[PDB]
Amino acid sequence: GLIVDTRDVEERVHVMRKTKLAPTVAHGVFNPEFGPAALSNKDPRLNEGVVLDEVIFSKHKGDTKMSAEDKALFRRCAADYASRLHSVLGTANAPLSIYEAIKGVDGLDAMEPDTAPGLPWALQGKRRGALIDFENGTVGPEVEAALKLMEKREYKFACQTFLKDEIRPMEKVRAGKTRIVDVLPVEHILYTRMMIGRFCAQMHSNNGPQIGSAVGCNPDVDWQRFGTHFAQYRNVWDVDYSAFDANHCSDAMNIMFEEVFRTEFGFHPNAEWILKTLVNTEHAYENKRITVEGGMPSGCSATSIINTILNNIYVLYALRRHYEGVELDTYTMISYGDDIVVASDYDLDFEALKPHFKSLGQTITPADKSDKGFVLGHSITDVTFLKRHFHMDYGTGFYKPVMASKTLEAILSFARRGTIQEKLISVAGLAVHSGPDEYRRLFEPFQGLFEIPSYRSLYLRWVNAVCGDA
RNA sequence: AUGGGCCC
RNA sequence: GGGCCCA
Ligand SMILES: [Mg+2]
C-alpha cells in the first residue's frame, strides 16, 4: 500500500512478546535453516543495520494508480470473471441473519469464540465472549450499536497490528522480515459475513479450476481432482507474486468490489460498502498510527476469497492487455490467495506479461528456481501449490500432496509448550505422502518419547478418503 | 488474526 | 473447547 500519515499518540497498544515456539528434540538433529521470527527490536539474532519497525512496514511501497483505459479494462475483466463465478454458484447471495453469520452455514465455519477482539475492545481488556453469545447466535449492546452504525454507513474503525509469531527461514529472520497480522474489530468481521457469507460458503463448496479457487479444498482428497485436470495441458506455470496482499491497488480493489458484489447478483447494497472500507485503513502499532491507502488487511473476513478473486482477475487483465481474443477459457487456473497455478494449451509468454501485472503494482516472478525467465513446457508434477507437490501415488495411481522434506523438518523442529504430541499427530498426516522411508526418518527423533502413528495406519486412512472404493 | 482443511 | 498445517 501507500503510507500517507505517521503520528505518535500516548494511547499505547502492547504486542511486544517473546516467542512461544520452543525447539524440539528434532532441532538438535535436523539443524534447519529455519527459526522463529524476531519479535523484539533488540533481538541478538538480528543483522547489523536492521530495525524491526522499519522492515515491518517496508512492504508499503506505494498505491499504484491506474489510467482510465486500464481501469475500464480491469472493469471488463472483473465483470467477465463475476459472470463466470455467479453462473456457477448461482445468485443466492441474500444476507445472513446475525445467527447465521455467527454459527455459520453449510460450508462456512462458525465464527471463532476466543480469538482477539480487535480495537477498541482490546484496550478495554474485554474478550470476544464479553460482546457476543457464540452458543445462541446473538450479540450484546455494543455490537448492535456498531451494527446499526454500519447499515447507516457511519461506522469507522482502526486495525490492530500483531507481529506474527511463526517459523521463518533464517535469512529472513536475520533481515528482520517478520510478517504482520492486521486484526479488525470483531463486529466488522460479523457484518462482512452477514453481507457476503452466503457467497463465501458457496465459493467454498464449489472450489476447483472452474471458479479458479482452491479455498475450501482438502489437499489429501482434492489433489487427485486438481492433478488430473492440470495434467491435460501443454503448459503449466508456477507464478510467484511479491507481497501480493499489500500491492493490491485502490483502483483494482474498488473496481473488483463494484463488479463482483452487485445487487443484481443478489447482494445487499452494503456488501460493496463494507468491502470498500478495506481500501483506506488505520493501523495501530504500540504508540504509532499509520494511515494506509491500498492493500488488503490480513485478518479481515473473506481475506482469502478477496485475494483469490483478485488473482483470477489479474491473470485475465494481464493477458488481455498483451494479447487479443483472450477469453476465460483461453486458459485455466486455480488460486488460494497469492498462491496460483495457471495452465493453457496456448504458448503464453509470462515473461512479456511482467509489465502488465506491473500496472496493478504486482510483480510476478517464476516460482521455479527463481530461474532467469518464465519457461514453457512445464507440467503439474513440476509445480507447487499450498507448499505441496503433485506426485503420483505409486500404488493407487492417484496424485498425492507431497511436502518438501526440508520443510517438514523445519515444522517438526519447533513447538509450543505442551503441544508436541498433538502436533506430531497432525504433521503425520502431511508426512505420510513422503513415503515409508522418509516418514520413518522424519519421526525417528521422537521415537520412545511420543506416540508416532504408523505409516500403514495413515496410508490406509488416506486411501479411503481419496476413494471409498479401492 | 481472516479463513480453509485436518487432528484429538 | 484444545492443537496443527497451508494461503
Ligand atoms: Mg505456488
Q: How far is the CA of A448 from the C1' of B3 (A)?
A: 36
Q: Which amino acid type is present at position A189?
A: I
C-alpha cell at A402: 507431497
Backbone dihedral angles phi then psi of residue A7, each to the nearest 5 degrees: -130, 155
Kindly tell me the burial class for residue A336, based on how many C-beta atoms sit within 10 Å of its own C-beta (0-12, 13-18, 19 or more): buried
Measured from Cα to the C1' atom, the residue closest to B2 is A299
Kindly give the distance from the C-alpha atom of residue A433 to the centroid of ligand 1, in angstroms, as a whole number: 19
H-helix segments, A165-284: 170-174, 186-205, 219-230, 244-247, 250-260, 269-276
Both A133 and A277 in a single domain? yes
Both A417 and A395 in a single domain? no
Footprint of strand C on the protein (CB under 7 A): A 113-114, 167, 303-304, 307, 336-339, 386-387, 407, 411, 415-416, 419, 422-423, 426-427, 430
Kindly give the distance from the C-alpha atom of residue A335 to the centroid of ligand 1, in angstroms, as a whole number: 9
Return the sign of the alpha-carbon dihedral for residues A86, A109, A273, A133: positive
Residue listed under C-alpha cell 520413518: A440
Positions of strand C less than 7 angstroms from a protein CB = 1-7
Both A103 and A237 in a single domain? no
C-alpha cell at A198: 452466503
How many Å separate Cα A237 from the centre of its chain? 19
Both A285 and A311 in a single domain? no
How many Å separate Cα A100 from the centre of its chain? 24
Which candidate, A231, A275, A274, A240, places its Cα nearest to that of A399? A231
Both A149 and A214 in a single domain? no
Which candidate, A268, A296, A151, places its Cα nearest to that of A199? A268
Q: What are the beta bridge partners of residue A8? A: A288
How far apart, in whole angstroms, are the C-alpha atoms of residue A187 and residue A374?
A: 44
Kindly give the distance from the C-alpha atom of residue A93 to the centroid of ligand 1, in angstroms, as a whole number: 31
Measured CA to CA in angstroms, residue A32 lies from A26, A429, A452 at distances of 10, 21, 21
Q: How far is the CA of A105 from the C1' of B2 (A)?
A: 17
Element (H, E) at A334: strand A332-336
Strand arrangement, sheet containing A388-392: A384-385, A388-392, A399-402
Contact A151/A15 with Cβ under 8 angstroms?
no
Residue listed under C-alpha cell 505409486: A394
Domain boundary among A385, A403, A421: A403
Strands (DSSP E) contained in A142-196 are 159-163, 167-169, 180-183
- Tell me whether strands A332-336 and A388-392 are parallel, antiparallel or unpaired: unpaired
How far apart, in whole angstroms, are the C-alpha atoms of residue A164 and residue A367?
A: 24
Both A224 and A280 in a single domain? no
Both A236 and A212 in a single domain? yes
Which candidate, A435, A431, A379, A88, places its Cα nearest to that of A228? A379
Backbone dihedral angles phi then psi of residue A51, each to the nearest 5 degrees: -115, 140
Positions of strand B less than 7 angstroms from a protein CB = 1-8
C-alpha cell at A22: 520452543
Non-local (6+) Cβ contacts of A6 within 8 A are A288, A289, A290, A291
How far apart, in whole angstroms, are the C-alpha atoms of residue A414 and residue A33?
A: 12
Both A410 and A274 in a single domain? no
Domain boundary among A238, A273, A302: A302
Tell me the residue range of the domain where A362 lies.
Answer: 208-248+303-403
Both A179 and A256 in a single domain? yes
Which candidate, A357, A355, A349, A356, places its Cα nearest to that of A374? A349
DSSP state of A375: P
Both A371 and A287 in a single domain? no
Domain boundary among A265, A282, A302: A302
Both A323 and A296 in a single domain? no
Total of domains in chain A: 3
Kindly give the distance from the C-alpha atom of residue A386 to the centroid of ligand 1, in angstroms, as a whole number: 6
SS (H, E, C) A389-427: EEEECCCCCCEEEECCHHHHHHHHCEEECCCHHHHHHHH
Q: How far is the CA of A398 from the C1' of C6 (A)?
A: 21
C-alpha cell at A455: 505409516
Determination technique for this PDB entry? Answer: X-ray
Q: How far is the CA of A386 from the C1' of C5 (A)?
A: 10
Both A63 and A91 in a single domain? yes
Contact A361/A247 with Cβ under 8 angstroms?
yes
Measured from Cα to the C1' atom, the residue closest to C6 is A386
Does residue A120 have a cis bond before it (omega within 30 degrees)?
yes
How far apart, in whole angstroms, are the C-alpha atoms of residue A363 and residue A245?
A: 12
User: For the domain that residue A441 is a member of, what is the CATH number?
Assistant: 1.20.960.20
User: For the domain that residue A336 is a member of, what is the CATH number?
Assistant: 3.30.70.270
Non-local (6+) Cβ contacts of A382 within 8 A are A236, A238, A368
